[PDB]
């Protein structure tokens, strides 16, 4: 890996992850996108240089730093015009944050419009060097991240406003397609008696994964950054942009066994080893897996997940027992999503210079009706309702800026107010749920809340949380360099988007 | 009404049924077309005078007469390039058939395309002099039909490929729109102290509904034209196509009574009076209702109707139980359906008459892979297991040419081999489900089966079910106007289709 400090080159360039080449967005020459490494309580400086040259799939952009809470640097969260202008093509932009209380398995992806898409997304990991589940591994470093990520051969402004599933799907950046020729798959290596920390990354667009490793078990210990009591599970049901570590006990027969990364739709199965890779034991042949696979008898269970560390659930044990509580009404009109019977259309001045600006109440901050403004050191409540009217489902929603503890899991109707976990990204489940979540308001700043399939949020399927406007410009100060990026970006012209 | 002798003028007219007014293909100058009736054992001589004048709506047509089994009619069923080649603007075409041995509520659509989403469409009801349910109610007439229809502001050709549902609900053929201006609620009348026997039908293109009658109950005593035992329910989900007749006791206070049709999606609810009409005892004042509904405490299971004759399942009580079983996969690539890796694509030459011309063999009948043979007088059972592969689930599957046993239904793991209802469209269910038919080949000829949500049909959902190839000639005499259909649609210019 790279990291904490480094350079991270946006360009154009064809890739072809499974067998068929296209123009993608790649960084420092690769999709998906670098590991970027560092230990809890580094500081990151990363040096965005877009050197972008298609239109088509965007010139401007702007990185997200998936799961760190930015607490003090709302400026760099990344979401265009929520907390910063997008990046011109021929300038550079640092990212400048630190990680004090944090540490897991995170990663980064363009969070304009949808670019990640097309291909601005990798993995981003924080070692803790006093890891409370150290003892339960040998081997946790570069080979041992895998990502999961939609492919798509027709780009995201060319093809369908909601395509159906994706062409393909890339395990560790390589995956086949249903086609006459197989590309190669990827190989993920490992030495037989050694336990491993696998740290699985959802980098999707859209679809959610089922993932599964044939004859291995996976012990979950940690759940979107968070450390969890260990979970033996047999089957991980994977929402975008969510994250587990599982520990892999390499106790099998050198052998190939076959990794499978089902897709919730689209080219699902494995027929001619589409949606899978090769866990391969040291001394197995170079070969395809023949390995079966069974009905799981674990799958992962949401409420089955526990906080390793207890973490107290914000507010008192009932319905609406918080300062704030929120409910949140999906909708749909055909081409765009709605919240509370409004679809986010992203305003001109980024809602944090809105709110340096001195706008401080939801009446005065735009775009109206899509900005909830929070008091500060308060405990929130925030139910997802699932509706056939929010097509797509099911929808798994993200909160930038800090961990929720998801008190109300899909499928379940059981209220957790002792020991949920806490997480940043949840399924909101199906027609029937009524997901539900609790964070205390303890980062003042504004921070996107949105489905995280990007066709849906880039459909309007998104509202800010604004907290603690009155001490958001004290506590975000920001450098000359973010104050400049409105100017230029509003001075380009349109064929430079 | 008209029938069982009439001529069916096709127009092409304007028309503003929830307000908004739109170009449509209307029948005898409206739409829903005119309630065709006669009574058990007539002879129906319907003269299609095709006048349509608007490519966009498609200037040709074929009609298809539902839920009637065609038997030794087959070239009269509809279905375009299975049954016959459509009708030509400037010409018409006489439907002529009998129906001895069946009684109950059915309706005519166009069979081509989408055409009957833009409005040829319409209520179809076959009196039985002897009808064992007489002794039930007091009045079943022309006022007692209650159509459902989704409209759409957009014609067929010209919106989305699949519309997230429609811009208004009509019953009768009057609904609201969400705008600001209210128009018309149809009104359904009726004198206290009556009984009345409701024909329900959904002239659907796609969404299924939920209907329901503040304050009444419903005793369902027919389904799909199927005498059924008396059922007590308070809310009924029909899907596109179907039809029930319930008995209604108007035993309530003279008043004004929401009737409610909710879509499954689209504009849902009942703001502003939209997915309503009203039923009003006579003597209540010319208003609005201002009932409330309740949740269901019986609504409608498909499991819960038996038919009141008995009816004999076909084939021996275990899955597979029959003389041919058939499975079928569903898929989708986005868009177009696929059913056993085959999307249909309507031939040249009308399925009928490839068979009529010698071709007996499913090797031999276009399209390759979408016609099924199936040898005469045995027992079939398919079984349509739902998947998210195929989404616009739960798709509701129609068969032509007969009723099939429901031997599993949706949202049911029971199968019943013992007094299952018969039908002729059934909801395919949602991922989990694996709803399964019997019916016995009884009836030579090609007969289409397929979704009933046209948007599905039209993007190739669909089979075809050729039963007694050897005897299909012999068994479908066709008249000589019916040999002149495909000479005259093959000469016209592509302008005039
Ligand atoms: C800027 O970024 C854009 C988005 O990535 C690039 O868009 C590309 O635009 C081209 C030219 O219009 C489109 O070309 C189409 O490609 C297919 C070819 O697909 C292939 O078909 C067989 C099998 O499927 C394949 O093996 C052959 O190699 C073909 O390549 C054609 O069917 C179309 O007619 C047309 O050629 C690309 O599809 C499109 N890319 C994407 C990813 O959407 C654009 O090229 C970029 N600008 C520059 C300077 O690179
Ligand atoms: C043949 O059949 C076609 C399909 O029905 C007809 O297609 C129509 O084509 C016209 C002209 O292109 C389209 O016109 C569009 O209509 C809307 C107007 O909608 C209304 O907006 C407000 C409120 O929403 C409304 O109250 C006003 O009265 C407007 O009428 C415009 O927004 C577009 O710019 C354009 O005018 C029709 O939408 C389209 N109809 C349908 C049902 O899709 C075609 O006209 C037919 N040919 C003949 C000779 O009648
Ligand atoms: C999903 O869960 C949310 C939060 O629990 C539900 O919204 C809440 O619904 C409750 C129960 O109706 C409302 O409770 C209150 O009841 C009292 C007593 O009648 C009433 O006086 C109050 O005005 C209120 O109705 C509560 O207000 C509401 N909470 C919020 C923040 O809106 C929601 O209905 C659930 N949705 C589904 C589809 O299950
Ligand atoms: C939906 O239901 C259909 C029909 O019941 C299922 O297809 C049937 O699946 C059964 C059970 O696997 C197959 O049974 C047979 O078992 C013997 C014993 O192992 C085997 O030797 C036979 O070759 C056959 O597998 C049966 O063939 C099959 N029937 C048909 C017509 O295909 C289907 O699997 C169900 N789908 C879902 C998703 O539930
Ligand atoms: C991995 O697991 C599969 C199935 O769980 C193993 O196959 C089973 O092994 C038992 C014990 O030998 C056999 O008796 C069963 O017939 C098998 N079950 C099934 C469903 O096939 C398999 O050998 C293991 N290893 C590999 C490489 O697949
Ligand atoms: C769905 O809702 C969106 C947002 O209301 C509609 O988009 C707006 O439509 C009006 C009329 O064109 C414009 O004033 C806005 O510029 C639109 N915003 C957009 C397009 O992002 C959209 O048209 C609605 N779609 C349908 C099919 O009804
Ligand atoms: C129709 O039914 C509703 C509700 O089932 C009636 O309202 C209920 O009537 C009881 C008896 O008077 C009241 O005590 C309850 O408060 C009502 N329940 C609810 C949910 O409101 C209603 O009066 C009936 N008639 C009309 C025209 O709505
Ligand atoms: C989905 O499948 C349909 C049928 O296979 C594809 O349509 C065919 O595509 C090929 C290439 O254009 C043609 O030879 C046929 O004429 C097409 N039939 C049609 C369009 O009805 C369709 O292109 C596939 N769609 C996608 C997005 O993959
Ligand atoms: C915020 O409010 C609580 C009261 O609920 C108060 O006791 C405390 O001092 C504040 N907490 C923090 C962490 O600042
Ligand atoms: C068809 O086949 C059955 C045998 O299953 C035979 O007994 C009978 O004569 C035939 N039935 C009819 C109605 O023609
Ligand atoms: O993550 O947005
Ligand atoms: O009915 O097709
Ligand atoms: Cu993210
Ligand atoms: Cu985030
Ligand atoms: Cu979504
Ligand atoms: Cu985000
Ligand atoms: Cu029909
Ligand atoms: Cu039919
Ligand atoms: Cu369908
Ligand atoms: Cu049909
Ligand atoms: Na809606
Ligand atoms: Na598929
Ligand atoms: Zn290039
Ligand atoms: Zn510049
Ligand atoms: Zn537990
Ligand atoms: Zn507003
Ligand atoms: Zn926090
Ligand atoms: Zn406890
Ligand atoms: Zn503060
Ligand atoms: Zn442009
Ligand atoms: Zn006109
Ligand atoms: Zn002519
Ligand atoms: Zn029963
Ligand atoms: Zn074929
Ligand atoms: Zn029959
Ligand atoms: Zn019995
Ligand atoms: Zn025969
Ligand atoms: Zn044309």
């Known amino acids: 890996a790279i990291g904490p400090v480094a350079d991270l080159t946006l360009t154009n360039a064809q890739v072809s992850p499974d067998g068929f080449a296209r123009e993608a967005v790649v960084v420092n020459g690769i999709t998906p996108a670098p590991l970027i490494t560092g230990n809890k309580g580094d500081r990151f400086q990363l040096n965005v240089i877009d050197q972008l ?10 990185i997200h730093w998936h799961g760190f809470f930015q607490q003090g640097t709302n400026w760099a969260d990344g979401p265009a015009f929520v907390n ?3 990046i011109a093509s021929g300038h550079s932009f640092l990212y400048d944050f630190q990680v004090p ?20 997304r990798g993995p981003f990991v924080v070692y803790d060097p006093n890891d409370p589940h150290a003892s339960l591994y040998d081997i946790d470093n570069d080979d041992t991240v895998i990502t999961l990520a939609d492919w798509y051969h027709v780009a995201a402004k ?9 062409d393909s799907t890339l395990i560790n950046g390589l995956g086949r397609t249903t086609g006459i020729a197989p590309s190669d798959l990827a190989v993920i290596k490992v030495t037989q008696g050694k336990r491993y920390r696998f740290r699985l990354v959802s980098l999707s667009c859209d679809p959610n994964h089922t993932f599964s490793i044939d004859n291995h078990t996976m012990t979950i210990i940690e759940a979107d950054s968070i ?39 689209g080219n699902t199965g494995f027929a001619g080893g589409i949606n899978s890779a090769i866990l391969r034991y040291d001394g197995a042949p170079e070969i395809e897996p023949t390995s079966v696979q069974t009905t799981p008898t674990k799958p992962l269970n949401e409420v089955d997940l526990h906080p390793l560390s207890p973490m107290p659930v ?77 097509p797509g489902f099911p929808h798994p929603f993200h909160l930038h800026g800090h961990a929720f503890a998801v008190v109300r899991s899909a499928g379940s109707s059981v209220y957790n107010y002792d020991n949920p976990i806490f997480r940043d990204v949840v399924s909101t489940g199906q027609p029937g749920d009524n997901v539900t979540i609790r964070f205390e308001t303890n980062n003042p700043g504004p921070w996107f809340l949105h489905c995280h399939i990007d066709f849906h949020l880039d459909a309007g399927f998104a509202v800010v949380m604004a907290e603690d406007t009155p ?5 975000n100060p920001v450098p000359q360099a973010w104050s400049d990026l409105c100017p230029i970006y509003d001075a380009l012209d349109p064929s430079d988007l």
């Not at 040259?53 to 702007?62: E, G, Q, V």
């Open 101 to 120: 209380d944090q540490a897991g398995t995170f990663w980064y992806h363009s969070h304009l419009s949808t670019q990640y898409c097309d291909g601005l």
């Open 314 to 390: 914000p507010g008192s044990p009932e319905p609406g027992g918080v300062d704030k509580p929120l409910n949140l009404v999906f909708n749909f009109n055909g081409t765009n999503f709605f919240i509370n019977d409004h679809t986010f259309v992203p305003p001109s001045v980024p809602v944090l210079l809105q709110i340096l600006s001195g706008a401080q109440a939801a009446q005065d901050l735009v775009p109206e009706g899509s900005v909830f403004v929070l008091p500060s050191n308060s405990s929130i409540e925030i139910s997802f309702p699932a509706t056939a009217n929010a």
């Open 227 to 265: 450390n969890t009591q260990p979970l033996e599970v047999d089957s991980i049901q994977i929402f975008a942009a969510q994250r587990y570590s599982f520990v892999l006990d390499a106790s099998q027969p050198v052998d190939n066994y076959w990794i499978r990364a089902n897709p919730a739709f």
């Open 471 to 475: 001490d958001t410009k004290a506590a």
């Open 53 to 62: 040259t298609n239109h088509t799939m965007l010139k401007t952009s702007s």
């Open 158 to 166: 060319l093809g369908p406003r909601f395509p159906f599933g994706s």
């Open 84 to 86: 910063q202008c997008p």
